[PDB]
């Protein structure tokens, strides 16, 4: 690629964004378990947030 | 209702349109002063319709059109008070400004920065009508500091001259000394009444109104050049004659008088504030008229004349006649 250097910061964004989403699944202890937001699962659904 | 408020806001937006025209320029204008003068002629004609239908019924209103900022219990909205004071002072200021700018198309004809001059003079007019159409103390403070800064930029027009820069910084200095008391007033009204709006100030109607009215008197002493804070208005004759003619005779210098006229429900129940206003206005109208008797610069004589008449306005506020004082402004 003639402009390989102009993807170092955006891919480093996306990967970083990716890792943030990947951290959220480690902090999913109280997903659909808080007293404010707990509810019954709608059909064709397995988690409330991802 | 739909005609009154429409032409009310059309006057102000019509004044702001040549600022967008001068800021979005590429060419040399085909007589931008004629464009701004036509704009202010049409703004005068436009503002005469809500004035006529206030003479008809007495129709006052408030346009709190844009919710700007809620500091937890203080809802600052873009709020325009169309009462007797706005309905009379806006067409008088537009008519006077239209005459001043047709004068300025001749007096400033050799100036290569005439478009900047008409830009600054229109910005002064915009900030002054922000001042007199304001409904809360924040927007009135915007118009207040706006006419102070356009006073700075129009006194120090010939900025290579040392004395113009000196007189402009002098005028800013005395106005900020008045702004100490104005911000004292805003502070008192927020802390004791949870408002800067005029309606809640007038409806709650406090009896311990010594301190905020002293702050408003200090603000008017700064702005209208009463005694103690007077010499910047003779010093302000260093700017061009349309600057000394629009700003420093008729329009900006009455804003302190207009500020005390605007708070007439508080001054009508404070005899101590009326006494302070009466004494300060009489002191000013004596002292400046006495100083006028021996001057030889003609603009200084007319500046002491208009400060003497502002002292007379402060006198007739101090005898609990705010509407005669506002009639004397418009006169």
């Amino acid at each position: 690629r003639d402009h390989w250097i102009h993807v170092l910061v955006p891919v480093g964004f996306v990967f970083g964004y990716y890792l943030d989403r990947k951290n959220d699944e480690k902090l999913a202890a109280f997903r659909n378990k808080s007293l404010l937001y707990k509810r019954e699962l709608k059909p064709q659904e397995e988690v409330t947030w991802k | 209702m739909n005609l009154f408020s429409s032409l009310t806001l059309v006057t102000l937006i019509l004044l702001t349109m040549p600022i967008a025209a001068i800021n979005f320029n590429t060419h040399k204008f085909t007589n931008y002063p004629l464009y701004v003068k036509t704009t202010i002629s049409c703004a005068f004609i436009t503002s005469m319709i809500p004035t006529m239908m206030f003479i008809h019924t007495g129709q006052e209103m408030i346009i709190s059109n844009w919710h700007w900022l809620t500091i937890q219990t203080l809802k600052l909205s873009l709020s325009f008070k169309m009462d007797f004071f706005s309905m009379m002072f806006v067409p008088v200021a537009l008519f006077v400004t239209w005459s001043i700018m047709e004068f300025s198309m001749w007096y400033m004809h050799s100036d290569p920065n005439i478009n900047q001059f008409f830009k600054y003079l229109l910005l002064f007019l915009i900030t002054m009508l922000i001042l007199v159409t304001a409904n809360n103390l924040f927007q009135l403070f915007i118009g207040w500091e706006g006419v102070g800064i356009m006073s700075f930029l129009l006194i120090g027009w010939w900025y290579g001259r040392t004395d113009a820069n000196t007189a402009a910084l002098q005028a800013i200095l005395y106005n900020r000394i008045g702004d100490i008391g104005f911000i004292l007033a805003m502070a008192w009204f927020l802390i004791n009444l949870n408002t800067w709006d005029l309606q809640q100030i007038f409806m709650l109607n406090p009896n311990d109104s010594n301190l905020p009215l002293m702050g408003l008197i200090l603000a008017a002493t700064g702005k209208s050049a009463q005694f103690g804070l007077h010499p910047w208005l003779p010093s302000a004759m260093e700017g061009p004659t349309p600057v000394s003619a629009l700003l420093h005779s008729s329009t900006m210098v009455v804003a302190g008088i207009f500020l005390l006229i605007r708070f007439y429900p508080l001054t009508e129940n404070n005899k101590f504030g009326q006494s302070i206003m009466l004494c300060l206005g009489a002191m000013t109208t004596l002292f400046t008229a006495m100083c006028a008797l021996t001057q030889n610069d003609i603009k200084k004589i007319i500046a002491f004349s208009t400060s003497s008449q502002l002292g007379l306005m402060m006198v007739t506020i101090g005898i609990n006649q705010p509407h005669l004082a506002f009639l004397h402004i418009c006169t």
Partner: protein, 65 residues
């Protein structure tokens, strides 16, 4: 001009000598106003707090602070 600015900024401390006049002026204009405004603001706030906890100060429509 360079000599003027170097005198006004950089030559001040290397030609300072602590003595009677400089100590009295540096303690008179340095901590004098600090003591003054401390006692004024402390007196005003003690008076205000003593009025407030007795129910004397009109704090009726005061809900912004």
């Amino acid at each position: 001009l360079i000599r003027w600015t170097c005198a006004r900024s950089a030559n001040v401390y290397p030609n300072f000598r602590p003595n009677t006049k400089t100590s009295l002026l540096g303690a008179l204009f340095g901590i004098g106003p600090l003591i003054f405004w401390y006692y004024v603001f402390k007196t005003d706030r003690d008076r205000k707090e003593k009025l407030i906890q007795e129910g004397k100060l009109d704090r009726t429509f005061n809900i912004s602070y």
